[PDB]
């Protein structure tokens, strides 16, 4: 599996480059998205024809995101679309790989920054060859959180997204940031740059790569309820530690959402 | 005044370095803040003993921020305190310089990124020697905005900060980001990376440096009312153009605040 991983890192860099080259300069973000997943999918089918793959293409072609025991690649060609369009500086290419339904490695590349985050189950997390360690803050009032406002303009939803932000802001927490991509937000928690990231409405391909980088940097992922993280539930709390994770968990309120499963 | 400016750029770099060195490693953010404004203020008094200076030191020592005709340096030693503490990657050193009550140049340095933004009245804006040009988006529904949630946990205030974010989110706009510093947020609008930044509750030293960089990159600053930007009013809309600026202006609601003036 290390060859698979070391392959995936070259494939993340190359994809990274097509995204970056296109950021200098059917809209451009769609043209570049179609090119990079074709690049990414037929490069994994040629070298690994045995392996399965979950992504948005497979879901849109009617297949269900259900993870089996066979090597699956959970691919996100460009994480940070709106960003791409604005040249707002954070877009990531994401690749997560699972065997026996557990993620084995994750590779996230932040194009415009030139940063390559990798992690492998058991061997630790690194940003560009330097090891990552999450923070030690266990006090919620001194923690800095990252989250996003959603892609939904449905007012019942928007009011809850803002309602939950308010409750946490008033705890008080140190502050909240939004950088515009879920994969990069989780890498910021892996470095120690933020203390926790929560979001309800993401998709498994958005988080499968960076989830393992949070944990090999020493953090915890868990469900918005307090229960175990569930890759197909559309919701995540990636934190530096359980204390903080549970805190966030007890205060927010669920936004009903249809599992990636159903 | 170019020597003054070219001096200020070396003084911004050096200060930048003390902030960066201290980010590798009375709390550390206070120790580093006291060191950098001592560095910054006695270096400007020795070379320019004629010149006045507005900053937080002068205000806290009871003097009023009232700008006169004489060369004034409006200094912000570390913009992005909470960030500094978390190692969240964006802290800026800011230096704005005014003669005859109009800003003549601004120099903003984003430490951890290594980026040096400068601008001089009439000669254009540059990030690290490359010229900056704001965006062309005049459609609010495709614009990306940056703003911050405030440093106040007063619930009448928090509810309005979130109330205004909601109205703009529901227009709809493309999205909203928060990077944690006002000086860096305004530089993002100067590059074209975002289309507008608004905030109510900043201080003149937070924005005096980057305001000129927005305008020499081709944008507009204006008051939250639609009127002319007022450096001492505690409020700003830094946009790529008037259309967008006025749009934001007509939708938000004021948070009463005590001028830097009074």
Report the distance separating Cα B172 and Cα B221, nearest Å.
Answer: 22
DSSP string of chain B, one letter each residue: -HHHHHHHHHHHHHHHHHHHHHHH---HHHHHHHHHHHHHHHHHHHH-TT-EEESHHHHHTT------SS-EEEEEEEE-HHHHHHT-S--EEEEEEEETTEEEEEEEEETTTTEEEEEETTTEEEETTEE--------GGG-EEE----S---HHHHHHHHHHHHHHHTTT-SEEEB-S-HHHHHHHHHHTSSSEEEEES--HHHHHHHHHHHHHTT-EEE-TTSSB--TTSSEEEEESSHHHHHHHHHH--------TT-
Is the CB of residue B159 less than 8 Å from the CB of residue B165?
A: no
Closest residue by Cα to residue A59 from A39, A47, A44, A74: A74
Q: Indicate where chain B has its CATH 3.30.540.10 domain(s).
A: 1-132
User: Which chain A positions have a beta carbon within 8 Å of B181's beta carbon?
Assistant: none
**Interface residues from chain A to B (CB-CB < 8 Å):** 82-83, 85-89, 135, 144, 149, 153, 155, 158-159, 162, 165-166, 169-170, 172, 174-180, 188, 191-195
Q: Could you tell me which chain B residue has the CA closest to the CA of A153? A: B170
Q: Do B192 and A87 touch (CB under 8 A)?
A: yes
Structure tokens at B133: 């040009």
Report the distance separating Cα A11 and Cα A98, nearest Å.
Answer: 17
* Partner residue opposite A82 with nearest CB, options B158, B162, B174: B174
User: Which chain B positions have a beta carbon within 8 Å of A87's beta carbon?
Assistant: 191-193
Closest residue by Cα to residue B234 from B151, B140, B146: B151
Report the distance separating Cα A92 and Cα A76, nearest Å.
Answer: 9
B78 catalytic residue (yes or no): yes
Report the distance separating Cα A221 and Cα A242, nearest Å.
Answer: 9
Catalytic residue among B17, B41, B57, B81: B81
Is the CB of residue A92 less than 8 Å from the CB of residue A127?
A: no
List B102's β-bridge partners, or say none: B99
* Partner residue opposite A166 with nearest CB, options B162, B176, B179: B162
* Partner residue opposite B153 with nearest CB, options A159, A172, A179: A172
Give the A:B interface size as CB pairs under 8 Å.
87
B57 assigned binding-site residue: no
Sequence-distant (≥ 6) Cβ neighbours of residue A21 within 8 angstroms = none
* Partner residue opposite B165 with nearest CB, options A89, A162, A170: A162
- Tell me the binding residues of A for substrate: 56, 78-81, 180-182, 199, 206
**Dihedral Cα B86, B186, A92, A80, nearest 10 deg:** 120
Report the distance separating Cα A218 and Cα A57, nearest Å.
Answer: 32
Report the distance separating Cα B252 and Cα A53, nearest Å.
Answer: 46
Is the CB of residue B213 less than 8 Å from the CB of residue B190?
A: yes
What is the spatial order of strands in the sheet that A130-131 belongs to? A52-54, A72-79, A92-99, A102-110, A115-120, A124-127, A130-131
**Interface residues from chain B to A (CB-CB < 8 Å):** 82-83, 85-89, 135, 144, 149, 153, 155, 158-159, 162, 165-166, 169-170, 172, 174-180, 188, 191-195
* Partner residue opposite A155 with nearest CB, options B87, B170, B178: B170
Q: Tell me which of 3.40.50.620, 3.40.190.10, 3.40.190.80, 3.40.50.2300 is the CATH number of domain B133-261.
A: 3.40.190.80
Report the distance separating Cα A230 and Cα B106, nearest Å.
Answer: 49
A56 catalytic residue (yes or no): yes
Signed CA dihedral, B21, B26, B29, B33: sign only: negative
Q: Give the long-range contacts of residues A60-65, CB within 8 A, separation 24 or more.
A: A64/A261, A65/A204, A65/A232, A65/A260, A65/A261
B260 assigned binding-site residue: no
Q: Indicate where chain A has its CATH 3.40.190.80 domain(s).
A: 133-261
Report the distance separating Cα B220 and Cα B150, nearest Å.
Answer: 23
Distances (CA, A) of B78 to A27, A257, B155: 40, 42, 27
Catalytic residue among B23, B44, B78, B140: B78
B206 assigned binding-site residue: yes
Report the distance separating Cα A29 and Cα A26, nearest Å.
Answer: 8
Closest residue by Cα to residue B165 from A195, A184, A169: A169
Report the distance separating Cα B52 and Cα B72, nearest Å.
Answer: 4
B56 assigned binding-site residue: yes
Is the CB of residue A54 less than 8 Å from the CB of residue A70?
A: no
Between helices B155-169 and B242-251, what is the axis angle to 10°?
Answer: 130
B79 assigned binding-site residue: yes
Q: Do B88 and A180 touch (CB under 8 A)?
A: no
A57 catalytic residue (yes or no): no
Q: Rounded to an integer, what is the distance from CA A114 to the centroid of its chain?
A: 17
**Min Cα–Cα distance to chain A from B42, Å:** 32
Report the distance separating Cα B198 and Cα B225, nearest Å.
Answer: 12
Is the CB of residue B224 less than 8 Å from the CB of residue B249?
A: yes
Catalytic residue among A33, A104, A148, A206: A206
Signed CA dihedral, B135, B139, B143, B145: sign only: positive
Q: Do A179 and B174 touch (CB under 8 A)?
A: no
Report the distance separating Cα B174 and Cα B3, nearest Å.
Answer: 42
Structure tokens at A232: 């197909």
A6 catalytic residue (yes or no): no
Q: Do B165 and A170 touch (CB under 8 A)?
A: no
Between helices B28-47 and B2-24, what is the axis angle to 10°?
Answer: 160
What superfamily would CATH give domain B1-132? Fructose-1,6-Bisphosphatase, subunit A, domain 1 (3.30.540.10)
A76 catalytic residue (yes or no): yes
Distances (CA, A) of A181 to A27, A150, A163, B181, B207: 20, 11, 21, 19, 27
User: Which chain A positions have a beta carbon within 8 Å of B169's beta carbon?
Assistant: 149, 153, 158, 162
Catalytic residue among A57, A81, A138, A246: A81
Q: What is the CA radius of gyration of chain B?
A: 17
Q: Do A169 and B180 touch (CB under 8 A)?
A: no
């Amino acid at each position: 599996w290390q060859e698979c991983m070391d392959y995936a890192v070259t494939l993340a860099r190359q994809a990274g480059e097509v995204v970056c080259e296109a950021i200098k300069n059917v809209d451009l973000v769609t043209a570049t998205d179609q090119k990079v997943e074709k690049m990414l999918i037929s490069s994994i089918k040629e070298k690994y024809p045995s392996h399965s793959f979950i992504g948005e293409e497979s879901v849109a072609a009617g297949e269900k995101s259900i993870l089996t025991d066979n090597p699956t690649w959970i691919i996100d060609p460009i994480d940070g679309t709106t960003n791409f369009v604005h040249r707002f500086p954070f877009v990531a290419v994401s690749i997560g790989f699972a065997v026996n339904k557990k993620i084995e490695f994750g590779v996230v590349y932040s194009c415009v920054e030139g940063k390559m985050y990798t992690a492998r189950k058991g061997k630790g997390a690194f940003c560009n060859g330097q090891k990552l360690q999450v923070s030690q803050q266990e006090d919620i009032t001194k923690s800095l959180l990252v989250t996003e406002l959603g892609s939904s303009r449905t007012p019942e939803t928007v009011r809850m997204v803002l309602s939950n932000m308010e409750k946490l802001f008033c705890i008080p927490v140190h502050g909240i940031r939004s950088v515009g991509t879920a994969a990069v937000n989780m890498c910021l928690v892996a470095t120690g740059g933020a203390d926790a990231y929560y979001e309800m409405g993401i998709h498994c391909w958005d988080v499968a790569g960076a989830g393992i980088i949070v944990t090999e940097a020493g953090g915890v992922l868990m469900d918005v309820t307090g229960g175990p993280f569930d890759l197909m539930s559309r919701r995540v709390i990636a934190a530096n530690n359980r204390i903080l994770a549970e805190r966030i968990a007890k205060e927010i309120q669920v936004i009903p959402l249809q599992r990636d499963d159903e």
